[PDB]
């Protein structure tokens, strides 16, 4: 039920991508293989301690959202947490990026722009190799709304995150950026394949 809800979010938020599948592959849906709840007490507490601090700075409201994250480093993330020291060249600078559309995070699973794809077949559209996405609790707090590229090193003054909003000459889909790794928790590890349309 918790997992059916995660599967529903994963499938229903897929969009057709402007790059025609170059980065993440060609698909309309996934084959969801496994959904695992990550239980890392030390990381959870690091997350909730910061969430409380952010809520206190944002009119008693954490502005928490469940968002996707794609990375070749899912294993390190679930053990050590998100780490801004790994994050300036990105559209919103040196942040940790999240999507509300699973297929946008799927474009980052094998690297920026999909890298060279899966390690076995070197295919960004591999229907064989199993992929992993994270479905994360993300504390946005007071989120700075931005439409165009703004290369920042940290959250804007008085803010806790950046929300990249869609615009005609800019973003096709939203994205959410934090500048402190403790503002996200890798709640669910989703193992899946993209499916041939
Ligand atoms: N990861 C996501 O799910 C993700 C979702 C949404 C937008 C992103 N934009 C940039 C990057 C990004 C990935 C790696 C590096 Cl090194 C820098 C930025 N990731 C993104
Ligand atoms: Zn493959």
């Amino acid at each position: 039920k918790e997992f059916q809800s995660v599967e529903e979010e994963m499938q229903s938020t897929v969009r057709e991508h402007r790059d025609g599948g170059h980065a993440g592959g060609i698909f309309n849906r996934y084959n969801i293989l496994k959904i695992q709840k990550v239980c890392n007490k030390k990381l959870w507490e690091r997350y909730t301690h910061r969430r409380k601090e952010v809520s206190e700075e944002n009119h008693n409201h954490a502005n928490e959202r469940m968002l996707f994250h794609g990375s070749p480093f899912v294993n390190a993330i679930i053990h050590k947490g998100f780490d801004e020291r790994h994050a300036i060249g990105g559209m919103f600078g040196a942040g940790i990026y999240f999507a509300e559309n699973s297929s946008k995070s799927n474009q980052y699973v094998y690297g920026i722009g999909g890298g060279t794809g899966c390690p076995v077949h070197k295919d960004r559209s591999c229907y064989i190799c199993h992929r992993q996405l994270l479905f994360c609790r993300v504390t946005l707090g007071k989120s700075f709304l931005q439409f165009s590229a703004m290369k920042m090193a940290h959250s804007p003054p008085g803010h806790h995150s950046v929300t990249g909003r869609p615009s005609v000459n800019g973003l096709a889909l939203a994205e959410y950026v934090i500048y402190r790794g403790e503002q996200a928790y890798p709640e669910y590890l989703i193992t899946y394949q993209i499916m041939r349309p």
Side-chain angles (χ1 to χ4, degrees):
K1 171 69 154 143
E2 202 190 327
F3 301 154
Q4 266 168 28
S5 177
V6 179
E7 163 144 26
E8 181 54 16
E9 199 73 29
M10 178 83 168
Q11 304 283 17
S12 72
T13 67
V14 173
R15 293 297 176 269
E16 292 184 292
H17 288 280
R18 255 111 114 141
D19 78 348
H22 178 87
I26 303 151
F27 66 97
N28 304 125
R29 67 157 286 173
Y30 310 106
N31 185 27
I32 294 160
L33 303 165
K34 201 183 262 238
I35 301 169
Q36 291 167 285
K37 199 162 184 177
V38 170
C39 303
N40 181 331
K41 195 179 251 165
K42 276 189 175 78
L43 277 195
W44 179 248
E45 291 186 345
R46 175 184 114 175
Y47 178 72
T48 63
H49 180 89
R50 174 63 180 156
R51 185 174 65 184
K52 184 170 180 285
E53 185 170 62
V54 170
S55 303
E56 287 171 359
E57 295 183 2
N58 190 45
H59 318 285
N60 188 48
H61 182 50
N63 188 22
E64 176 177 92
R65 279 204 58 202
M66 293 300 300
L67 301 169
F68 299 94
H69 184 78
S71 175
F73 311 111
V74 289
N75 177 255
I77 298 162
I78 70 174
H79 287 100
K80 292 131 84 178
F82 288 97
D83 186 351
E84 72 291 340
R85 300 171 287 185
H86 296 294
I88 205 77
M91 189 179 37
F92 299 111
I96 305 158
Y97 290 71
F98 296 86
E100 64 176 3
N101 301 96
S102 66
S103 58
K104 179 170 185 169
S105 289
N106 175 62
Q107 307 185 298
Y108 291 91
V109 166
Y110 293 129
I112 297 156
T116 53
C118 67
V120 174
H121 319 91
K122 299 198 183 291
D123 180 5
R124 282 181 302 278
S125 193
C126 200
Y127 296 108
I128 307 151
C129 296
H130 299 175
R131 296 174 188 220
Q132 294 185 313
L133 262 184
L134 295 165
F135 191 45
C136 308
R137 238 170 238 255
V138 180
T139 289
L140 303 168
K142 193 173 278 92
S143 198
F144 190 87
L145 311 185
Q146 185 72 4
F147 286 88
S148 60
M150 185 177 54
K151 278 180 217 300
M152 75 207 88
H154 303 295
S155 283
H159 293 78
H160 304 106
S161 66
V162 167
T163 290
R165 290 276 193 87
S167 77
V168 168
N169 218 51
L171 287 171
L173 298 164
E175 59 193 60
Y176 308 86
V177 191
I178 60 174
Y179 298 88
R180 291 173 60 159
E182 63 272 19
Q183 273 173 231
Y185 178 78
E187 201 166 31
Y188 299 97
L189 174 64
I190 303 159
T191 301
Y192 70 99
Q193 297 148 300
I194 54 157
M195 283 174 77
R196 204 183 296 270

